[PDB]
Write an enzyme that holds these catalytic residues in place. Structure first.
Site, PDB file in Angstrom:
ATOM      1  N   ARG A   5       0.818  -1.229   0.000  1.00 16.16           N
ATOM      2  CA  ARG A   5       0.000   0.000   0.000  1.00 16.16           C
ATOM      3  C   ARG A   5       0.848   1.276   0.000  1.00 16.16           C
ATOM      4  NH1 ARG A   5       0.500  -1.964   4.869  1.00 16.16           N
ATOM      5  NH2 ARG A   5      -1.110  -3.602   4.804  1.00 16.16           N
ATOM      6  N   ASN A  26       0.697   0.482   7.621  1.00 19.27           N
ATOM      7  CA  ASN A  26       1.480   1.679   7.368  1.00 19.27           C
ATOM      8  C   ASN A  26       1.644   1.952   5.877  1.00 19.27           C
ATOM      9  OD1 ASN A  26       4.442   1.397   6.271  1.00 19.27           O
ATOM     10  ND2 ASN A  26       4.260  -0.374   7.676  1.00 19.27           N
ATOM     11  N   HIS A  73       7.940 -11.011  14.241  1.00 17.15           N
ATOM     12  CA  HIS A  73       7.410  -9.932  15.086  1.00 17.15           C
ATOM     13  C   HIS A  73       6.331 -10.365  16.081  1.00 17.15           C
ATOM     14  CE1 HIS A  73       3.613  -8.336  12.870  1.00 17.15           C
ATOM     15  NE2 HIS A  73       4.129  -9.043  11.872  1.00 17.15           N
ATOM     16  N   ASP A  93      -1.642 -12.652  12.249  1.00 21.00           N
ATOM     17  CA  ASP A  93      -0.480 -11.784  12.001  1.00 21.00           C
ATOM     18  C   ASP A  93      -0.225 -10.960  13.268  1.00 21.00           C
ATOM     19  OD1 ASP A  93       1.326 -10.051  11.029  1.00 21.00           O
ATOM     20  OD2 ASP A  93      -0.093  -8.948   9.695  1.00 21.00           O
ATOM     21  N   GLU A 108       7.081  -4.095  13.859  1.00 21.96           N
ATOM     22  CA  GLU A 108       7.189  -4.518  12.496  1.00 21.96           C
ATOM     23  C   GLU A 108       6.106  -3.850  11.700  1.00 21.96           C
ATOM     24  OE1 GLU A 108       4.987  -6.281  10.458  1.00 21.96           O
ATOM     25  OE2 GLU A 108       6.375  -6.923   8.824  1.00 21.96           O
ATOM     26  N   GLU A 116      16.320  -1.540  13.721  1.00 20.79           N
ATOM     27  CA  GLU A 116      17.126  -0.812  14.697  1.00 20.79           C
ATOM     28  C   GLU A 116      18.126  -1.743  15.367  1.00 20.79           C
ATOM     29  OE1 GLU A 116      17.170   2.566  14.970  1.00 20.79           O
ATOM     30  OE2 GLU A 116      15.925   2.264  13.214  1.00 20.79           O
ATOM     31  N   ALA A 136       9.098 -19.518   5.432  1.00 22.54           N
ATOM     32  CA  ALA A 136       8.183 -20.590   5.036  1.00 22.54           C
ATOM     33  C   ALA A 136       6.902 -20.431   5.800  1.00 22.54           C
ATOM     34  CB  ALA A 136       8.832 -21.937   5.408  1.00 22.54           C
ATOM     35  N   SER A 195      26.045  -4.109 -24.307  1.00 23.77           N
ATOM     36  CA  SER A 195      26.370  -5.526 -24.329  1.00 23.77           C
ATOM     37  C   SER A 195      26.190  -6.158 -22.962  1.00 23.77           C
ATOM     38  CB  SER A 195      27.799  -5.778 -24.793  1.00 23.77           C
ATOM     39  OG  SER A 195      27.971  -7.193 -24.880  1.00 23.77           O
ATOM     40  N   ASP A 197      33.416 -20.485   6.187  1.00 22.23           N
ATOM     41  CA  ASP A 197      33.484 -19.004   6.049  1.00 22.23           C
ATOM     42  C   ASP A 197      33.209 -18.640   4.589  1.00 22.23           C
ATOM     43  OD1 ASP A 197      33.941 -18.617   8.750  1.00 22.23           O
ATOM     44  OD2 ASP A 197      36.023 -17.895   8.522  1.00 22.23           O
ATOM     45  N   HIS A 217      22.031  -5.319  -1.881  1.00 24.21           N
ATOM     46  CA  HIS A 217      22.282  -6.616  -2.530  1.00 24.21           C
ATOM     47  C   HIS A 217      22.087  -6.375  -4.045  1.00 24.21           C
ATOM     48  CE1 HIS A 217      21.903 -10.967  -3.320  1.00 24.21           C
ATOM     49  NE2 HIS A 217      22.039 -11.198  -2.013  1.00 24.21           N
TER      50      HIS A 217
HETATM   51  N1  LIG Z   1       2.917  -7.768   9.118  1.00 23.91           N
HETATM   52  S1  LIG Z   1       3.100  -7.780   7.555  1.00 23.91           S
HETATM   53  O1  LIG Z   1       1.756  -7.483   6.917  1.00 23.91           O
HETATM   54  O2  LIG Z   1       3.696  -9.030   7.017  1.00 23.91           O
HETATM   55  N2  LIG Z   1       4.172  -6.550   7.218  1.00 23.91           N
HETATM   56  C1  LIG Z   1       3.591  -5.167   7.342  1.00 23.91           C
HETATM   57  C2  LIG Z   1       4.719  -4.097   7.352  1.00 23.91           C
HETATM   58  C3  LIG Z   1       5.649  -4.219   6.135  1.00 23.91           C
HETATM   59  C4  LIG Z   1       6.608  -3.031   5.938  1.00 23.91           C
HETATM   60  O3  LIG Z   1       6.390  -1.951   6.536  1.00 23.91           O
HETATM   61  O4  LIG Z   1       7.528  -3.197   5.126  1.00 23.91           O
HETATM   62  C5  LIG Z   1       2.675  -4.834   6.119  1.00 23.91           C
HETATM   63  O5  LIG Z   1       2.830  -5.445   5.030  1.00 23.91           O
HETATM   64  O6  LIG Z   1       1.860  -3.900   6.306  1.00 23.91           O
HETATM   65 CA   LIG Z   2      17.837   3.839  12.947  1.00 25.54          CA
HETATM   66 CL   LIG Z   3       7.474 -15.323   7.441  1.00 26.04          CL
HETATM   67 ZN   LIG Z   4       3.121  -9.634  10.193  1.00 30.24          ZN
HETATM   68 ZN   LIG Z   5       0.935  -7.216   9.550  1.00 27.44          ZN
END
Ligand SMILES: NS(=O)(=O)N[C@@H](CCC(=O)O)C(=O)O
Ligand SMILES: [Ca+2]
Ligand SMILES: [Cl-]
Ligand SMILES: [Zn+2]
Ligand SMILES: [Zn+2]
Ligand SMILES: *[C@@H]1O[C@H](CO)[C@@H](O[C@@H]2O[C@H](CO)[C@@H](O[C@@H]3O[C@H](CO)[C@@H](O)[C@H](O[C@H]4O[C@H](CO)[C@@H](O)[C@H](O)[C@@H]4O)[C@@H]3O)[C@H](O)[C@H]2NC(C)=O)[C@H](O)[C@H]1NC(C)=O
Ligand SMILES: *[C@@H]1O[C@H](CO)[C@@H](O[C@@H]2O[C@H](CO)[C@@H](O[C@@H]3O[C@H](CO)[C@@H](O)[C@H](O[C@H]4O[C@H](CO)[C@@H](O)[C@H](O)[C@@H]4O)[C@@H]3O)[C@H](O)[C@H]2NC(C)=O)[C@H](O)[C@H]1NC(C)=O
Ligand SMILES: *[C@@H]1O[C@H](CO)[C@@H](O[C@@H]2O[C@H](CO)[C@@H](O)[C@H](O)[C@H]2NC(C)=O)[C@H](O)[C@H]1NC(C)=O
Ligand SMILES: *[C@@H]1O[C@H](CO)[C@@H](O[C@@H]2O[C@H](CO)[C@@H](O)[C@H](O)[C@H]2NC(C)=O)[C@H](O)[C@H]1NC(C)=O
Ligand SMILES: *[C@@H]1O[C@H](CO)[C@@H](O[C@@H]2O[C@H](CO)[C@@H](O)[C@H](O)[C@H]2NC(C)=O)[C@H](O)[C@H]1NC(C)=O
Ligand SMILES: *[C@@H]1O[C@H](CO)[C@@H](O[C@@H]2O[C@H](CO)[C@@H](O)[C@H](O)[C@H]2NC(C)=O)[C@H](O)[C@H]1NC(C)=O
Ligand SMILES: *[C@@H]1O[C@H](CO)[C@@H](O[C@@H]2O[C@H](CO)[C@@H](O)[C@H](O)[C@H]2NC(C)=O)[C@H](O)[C@H]1NC(C)=O
Ligand SMILES: *[C@@H]1O[C@H](CO)[C@@H](O[C@@H]2O[C@H](CO)[C@@H](O)[C@H](O)[C@H]2NC(C)=O)[C@H](O)[C@H]1NC(C)=O
Ligand SMILES: *[C@@H]1O[C@H](CO)[C@@H](O)[C@H](O)[C@H]1NC(C)=O
Ligand SMILES: *[C@@H]1O[C@H](CO)[C@@H](O)[C@H](O)[C@H]1NC(C)=O
Ligand SMILES: *[C@@H]1O[C@H](CO)[C@@H](O)[C@H](O)[C@H]1NC(C)=O
Ligand SMILES: *[C@@H]1O[C@H](CO)[C@@H](O)[C@H](O)[C@H]1NC(C)=O
Ligand SMILES: *[C@@H]1O[C@H](CO)[C@@H](O)[C@H](O)[C@H]1NC(C)=O
Ligand SMILES: *[C@@H]1O[C@H](CO)[C@@H](O)[C@H](O)[C@H]1NC(C)=O
Ligand SMILES: NS(=O)(=O)N[C@@H](CCC(=O)O)C(=O)O
Ligand SMILES: [Ca+2]
Ligand SMILES: [Cl-]
Ligand SMILES: [Zn+2]
Ligand SMILES: [Zn+2]
Lengths: 691, 691
Positions: free
Chosen positions: B156, B203, B323, B333, B370, B379, B481, B571, B607, B630
């Site tokens: 979102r 959020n 979380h 969740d 989270e 953090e 998973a 290329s 390692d 990455h």
């Molecule tokens: N708890 S969750 O739905 O897997 N993760 C949240 C927060 C994800 C984020 O802020 O990146 C969400 O998608 O709104």
């Molecule tokens: Ca920070």
């Molecule tokens: Cl997960």
């Molecule tokens: Zn979640």
């Molecule tokens: Zn969530």
């Protein structure tokens, strides 16, 4: 036995002499065929000396050369446009070398082209404080002027940056005999002083650790994408050229305008050192004109990389590296260093042929294009950063072994202080009057620590040499050692001149090659201990001591501004707390290090020692200098050669009383205190018990 | 014996059920007293379960809450300024919870305040391609409009960013029954569908991995320096609010302007899905007005961190984290994940009390906040980055264990593919019709690989969960998973609604807790193998396979533009060469890994395995996203939930035919090819013989 004493005893002064002679007969300018041939020779010899693998690693980097058929020079031009005086097109070559070809004439590498004409302003050493004095106190405006500055005190690239930001349209650099002519010594070839026709070459970039100006972040390999020249890192925007003191006297003698502000602005020539702008009454319609036609050209360079595989920890690397490219013959810089490296490799190879191998891997490097901005070492480290990150134990530099014959000079991380003290107590002093005494004794006597009784001075690493990428970008414990004079950032008189020859060294610096041998023992002994000691020879407690010293120092700078610290609530409490914690945790780690047959606890503990320098790295880098990532040390923003401690806080506080938004300026000071306090605590926590 | 089977057999469905019930009786919103009390409970229980140390790690981060005495709502307002329709102030609470206090009403966390009034435009899912369709094809201008978008398909926060960049002055998000109401199933409480008064919280930040919006780069500890709100990372600049489909029907039903462009823009409500702008003739003077009064507030959050010290390699960390904070009761969740973690800790603790310890250290984490942008995990990783960098073997996430009951869903690094295949062949399927068959068999049957016969689908990691900092910023091999439905980025119907309760799970998802138990066996078995196997259970050859697939894919995107590739000499040869080299070197490393009693060669080889994911990290980050480092994977720039491969090249090519300087655009494509080719080769070289 195969121990450090066997290694050290195998080193011979006579071999170092033979190698220095061999390396200094012709010029080895980066990017030239002669320097490629020397690379191939070194590669072949390191193989015959016994290394496991010896490869060339090449890169295509931006270099800079004068135009052979359109030479650079400076004129005094009269009002009719007649060039009434011209600077020299070359240094008179030394005896017996007057027929050597391919001596590059004096030039400032990476100068843009141009023919600016204007009035001169004399700016002393062109330091930040010299421009403050001119602009703020004397109310002299450098905008649109040609600046003339004496070499010395700070890296010449900082001078150029300062002149550029002052609005200069060109810079003339010269060697004043105040800085480059020792009283009572003869000029070359009869002694080691600079003659009036001598000139110091050198690049004038401000790379801030980037390496090749066209490929910051990534090695300049065959498929590299390059910035356009307009987006290149660190190039100056105004023409620059260096001259000797005969030519400088001719440019300075007619200077008018204001008197020098005080005696610290006067050198040793028979001129008034008037600051200008422009010339006195009779000559006031004369101008100075530069003619710069140098070209920047992407050019292939070649590092030699030799490997001596470790018997027990082959995935741990101790690196001995120094450059091979020179401006002309490189009698001191760098071949006095490279000859010592060559003999060190020979000695390790002798032990190897007898069945010995070091515990850890030793890598030996002959870097190219150091003179053009540390390009060879930096490109190779960019290519190999992941290997170096995770496996790099230490880097020991090996540029010029001697820049004088007075005493030892060591710059290194605090992690190496104990190693250096212990090693120098076991080496013989080569100094007159100290026969039968230790090198530690002579060094401590001649260069006493300002902090501690009965200890020698050891300086902070700055930059201006090939350890920069390893230490300030990657956070690998680094050190360097050389013999020096009794001007510490100015260089010796013949620095980067055609007169820096084999004869200069053999006649005037080190005829018995005993200073070279002592430096080989120090550099070589350090590499031996780092590659062979069971426990890495790093003492974390020495970092705790210096961190407190640096915290005291930076707090003291801030406390020049008590009203502002009250207003903006500027506290150093977090940084002192971090340093106290680092001191406590380091003391406890040291106890465990003493108190543990278990190779996993050993290696876990060796990994803690190895990654402790790494912990001072901030992956976000310092403000506007992304390749200087070490939070405790960076090259000074005013002088690349000098190290600065807590550089993020130091630069936030520098000249802060001049900033027009004090709330924002002091906020950034507080931000830097937080970054430093956090980094010190995070480094401390790498020494805590792991679980 | 103490082996994986002992560990797995100790896990009990009935315990997971007891824990889920215990964790879901009251809301545990981040930053609230209830969630601190649950943190303390978990800490105490993990200690009693047998962990060596269990600590709370707290941070003070930016959170967002509605104003209790000034509620958020949306109106249709007539020309006299009478609010003729108002959206709900809360979701009707579920049976038996109508007296629960402190249920946060639906809101979009981090929305700014405002009361924008305007004409609606309907933008489908508010994806990049939906705005292309509106603006480029339909010529509809969103500037100064209020956008209404259905939830689904993409994160979102990306919808809000897209609406903002289109010039919208506000965004209304709603759940369409097309996406959130499965045909033939009853609404809560009689089934698992979303009722018309249900609303999805969540959020709407665009953090790009930064963590706390005020402290990017550094942990939000007691002395942290914070950005001002105006410089905060990732906050939206326009008000946003979510509603259910009863309220949405009232906003959509009067919409006029243009017809939807095709059927993919029509949901399931009895409205035309006119795109607008504004309402049809009779209602054309009516407007929509938002009233948003939420506040952003720096608030303390608490992670629980449990340590089970390794017997042999205590300085190597295998992390199981997920979380604990929820929007309301967190029935799925995250407490379906947290209950599984709790039982996993209990089982490891049972072995520990009997004298067993894992070979490597296991860290267990209950992350806070989270829901507000991965703040707790990020953090803590910022605080501990040096430890994690150098010691982190793997991270296994543990959010919701079930989002459906159809089959397993695994997203992970290629380094874990072989581990996951082998483990799932040894676990029993819980699925109806597969009794006595392996989980590998049922999973492969229900979710076949699109590439390979007889293999299951395993997806790329994107983001939207607590593995992000470990994988995309730090480069620690990561996996996840869960059980899922047969809409993959849309969520299940009751996602982030007050209706996500213990009863939802117990009645409709997993009454016998057998799916939860299977997920505990997969997550737990992975952690067991990662923490206990002598050789780390990573197969570098699996990365070689996928790198070729991703190179083929990105080349194929580029080859949609053959004339430009000819013109600008674009290329992919270097990238294919790097991938070929990685394939060769990985094959040779695998042979040595099979072919070596020597713990140093083992650990050297471990390692190499551990630092292989690390080698894909670029310390300069991706363009304008410094925390996504990455080079092979990043969250899609159009959908944080989806992973994108070769993201630097992918974003350089995206919509490139629209760029007004094709020379510059294609130059940046070439630059990204070089960065990717170099990184792949550099990662390959970490697997070469070390010396
Ligand atoms: N708890 S969750 O739905 O897997 N993760 C949240 C927060 C994800 C984020 O802020 O990146 C969400 O998608 O709104
Ligand atoms: Ca920070
Ligand atoms: Cl997960
Ligand atoms: Zn979640
Ligand atoms: Zn969530
Ligand atoms: C040096 O190491 C020491 C550990 O020996 C370490 O001490 C830690 O200091 C922090 C920061 O001061 C302490 O943080 C406190 O933690 C408690 C919970 O344990 C909180 O309740 C405290 O918050 C309250 O008080 C604050 C200050 O008045 C208020 O601002 C806040 O709103 C709360 O009311 C506070 O967060 C921490 O407990 C100790 N840890 C110990 C003793 O183990 C110190 O931080 C290290 N130095 C550095 C620079 O890291
Ligand atoms: C994959 O691994 C292979 C090694 O198996 C590696 O091959 C290397 O390729 C480079 C780049 O092509 C080779 O570079 C050449 O090196 C020689 C000296 O050895 C130079 O003389 C060559 O330069 C000349 O030719 C160029 C091309 O026409 C000109 O542009 C240039 O001006 C010169 O005239 C060239 O630099 C390198 O030798 C091999 N190394 C080997 C075979 O060991 C390849 O690079 C790896 N792939 C990636 C993406 O890293
Ligand atoms: C520096 O020493 C090297 C090595 O002894 C000399 O190069 C050798 O020269 C001989 C005689 O020409 C050749 O046969 C060998 O092939 C060379 N060996 C190499 C390059 O490894 C070189 O001549 C010396 N240079 C000077 C200026 O004295
Ligand atoms: C300084 O050098 C310049 C350039 O070589 C000299 O000026 C040139 O003189 C030649 C031959 O007399 C003329 O054809 C050119 O037109 C001049 N060039 C320029 C650019 O002026 C000049 O004479 C030299 N000055 C001194 C004192 O030697
Ligand atoms: C430098 O030498 C000193 C003196 O030998 C070393 O310090 C001793 O180390 C041994 C072995 O750990 C201890 O048992 C002694 O107590 C130490 N003596 C002290 C501290 O006065 C020191 O480790 C050496 N530094 C190195 C190797 O980096
Ligand atoms: C969830 O389970 C925990 C642990 O059993 C319960 O907390 C305990 O409650 C008893 C009875 O009030 C106390 O004496 C203990 O101090 C608690 N132990 C802890 C916090 O470790 C908690 O009551 C349960 N919650 C619900 C809602 O069922
Ligand atoms: C929607 O809610 C608003 C705000 O509560 C209602 O409008 C208010 O009505 C009260 C009492 O009748 C007035 O004193 C306020 O002045 C109104 N406030 C505003 C902002 O207009 C409105 O009646 C509600 N609409 C419906 C259909 O229920
Ligand atoms: C997954 O299981 C397979 C089959 O057991 C493992 O592959 C075998 O590994 C052993 C030990 O190295 C080899 O001797 C066999 O040749 C392998 N069989 C193959 C490749 O078909 C594989 O290592 C396991 N994956 C893990 C542990 O990550
Ligand atoms: C160097 O100068 C010559 C002679 O004036 C000129 O022809 C050539 O263009 C220059 N070479 C360069 C710029 O490389
Ligand atoms: C100095 O020089 C130029 C005059 O051309 C002017 O633009 C600039 O503002 C001057 N600055 C000061 C500080 O006098
Ligand atoms: C070398 O040492 C001697 C003794 O002081 C002296 O003749 C000479 O000046 C020194 N050389 C240099 C270059 O300092
Ligand atoms: C919440 O709304 C109330 C009532 O209108 C108001 O008094 C208070 O300022 C607001 N609280 C905030 C902004 O935290
Ligand atoms: C859309 O809206 C505003 C009208 O106020 C205008 O400034 C903007 O340029 C328009 N853009 C397009 C693409 O029509
Ligand atoms: C759980 O599985 C059964 C069998 O298909 C079914 O009654 C129900 O729809 C599933 N529940 C969910 C939430 O998918
Ligand atoms: N060869 S040297 O003098 O020690 N280093 C060179 C280059 C240093 C640099 O570019 O940083 C110099 O100072 O000019
Ligand atoms: Ca480069
Ligand atoms: Cl040096
Ligand atoms: Zn040098
Ligand atoms: Zn030099």
């Amino acid at each position: 036995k195969h121990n450090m004493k066997a290694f050290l005893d195998e080193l011979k002064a006579e071999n170092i002499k033979k190698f220095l002679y061999n390396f200094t007969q012709i010029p080895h300018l980066a990017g030239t065929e002669q320097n490629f041939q020397l690379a191939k020779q070194i590669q072949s010899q390191w193989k015959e000396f016994g290394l496991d693998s010896v490869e060339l690693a090449h890169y295509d980097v931006l270099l800079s050369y004068p135009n052979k058929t359109h030479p650079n020079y400076i004129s005094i031009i009269n009002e009719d446009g007649n060039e009434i005086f011209n600077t020299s097109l070359f240094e008179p070559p030394p005896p017996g070398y007057e027929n050597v070809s391919d001596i590059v004439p004096p030039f400032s590498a990476f100068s843009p082209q141009g023919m600016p004409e204007g009035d001169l302003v004399y700016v002393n050493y062109a330091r930040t404080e010299d421009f403050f004095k001119l602009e703020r106190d004397m109310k002299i405006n450098c905008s649109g002027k040609i600046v003339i500055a004496r070499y010395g005190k700070v890296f010449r690239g900082n001078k150029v940056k300062n002149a550029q930001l002052a609005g200069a349209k060109g810079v003339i650099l010269y060697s004043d005999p105040a800085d480059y002519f020792a009283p009572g010594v003869k000029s070359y070839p009869d002694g080691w002083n600079l003659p009036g026709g001598g000139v110091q070459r050198g690049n004038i970039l401000n790379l801030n650790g980037a390496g090749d100006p066209l490929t910051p972040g990534y090695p300049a390999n065959e498929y590299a994408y390059r910035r356009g020249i307009a987006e290149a890192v660190g190039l100056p925007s105004i023409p620059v050229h260096p001259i000797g003191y005969y030519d400088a006297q001719k440019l300075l003698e007619k200077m008018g305008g204001s008197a020098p502000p005080d005696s610290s602005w006067r050198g040793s020539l028979k001129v008034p050192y008037n600051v200008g702008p422009g010339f006195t009454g009779n000559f006031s319609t004369q101008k100075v004109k530069m003619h710069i036609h140098s070209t920047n050209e992407v050019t292939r360079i070649y590092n030699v990389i030799g490997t001596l595989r470790g018997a027990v920890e082959p995935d741990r690397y101790v690196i001995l590296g120094g450059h091979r490219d020179s401006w002309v013959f490189g009698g001191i810089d760098p071949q006095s260093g490279a000859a010592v490296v060559h003999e060190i490799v020979r000695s390790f190879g002798t032990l190897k042929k007898e069945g010995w191998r070091p515990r850890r891997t030793i890598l030996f490097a002959s870097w190219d294009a150091e003179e053009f901005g540390l390009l060879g070492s930096t490109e190779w480290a960019e290519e190999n950063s992941r290997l170096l990150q995770e496996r790099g134990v230490a880097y020991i530099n090996a540029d010029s072994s001697i820049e004088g014959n007075y005493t030892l000079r060591v710059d290194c991380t605090p992690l190496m202080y104990s190693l250096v003290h212990n090693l120098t107590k076991e080496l013989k002093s080569p100094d007159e009057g100290f026969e039968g005494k230790s090198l530690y004794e002579s060094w401590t006597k001649k260069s006493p620590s300002p902090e501690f009784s009965g200890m020698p001075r050891i300086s902070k690493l700055g930059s201006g040499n090939d350890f920069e990428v390893f230490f300030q970008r990657l956070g690998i414990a680094s050190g360097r050692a050389r013999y020096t004079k009794n001007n510490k950032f100015s260089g010796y008189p013949l620095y980067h001149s055609v007169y820096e020859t084999y004869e200069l060294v053999e006649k005037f610096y080190d005829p018995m090659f005993k200073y070279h041998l002592t430096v080989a023992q120090v550099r070589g002994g350090m590499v031996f201990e780092l590659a062979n000691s069971i426990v890495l020879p790093f003492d974390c407690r020495d970092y705790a001591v210096v961190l407190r010293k640096y915290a005291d120092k930076i707090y003291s700078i801030s406390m020049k501004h008590p009203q502002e610290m009250k207003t903006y609530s500027v506290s150093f409490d977090s940084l002192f707390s971090a340093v106290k914690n680092f001191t406590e945790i380091a003391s406890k780690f040291s106890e465990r290090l003493q108190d543990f047959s278990n190779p996993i606890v050993l290696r876990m503990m060796n990994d803690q020692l190895m990654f402790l320098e790494r912990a001072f790295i901030d992956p976000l880098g310092l403000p506007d200098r992304p390749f200087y990532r070490h939070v405790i040390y960076a090259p000074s923003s005013h002088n690349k050669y000098a190290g600065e401690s807590f550089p993020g806080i130091y630069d936030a506080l520098f000249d802060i009383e001049s900033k027009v938004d004090p709330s924002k300026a002091w906020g950034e000071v507080k931000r830097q205190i937080y970054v430093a306090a956090f980094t010190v605590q995070a480094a401390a926590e790498t020494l805590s018990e792991v679980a």
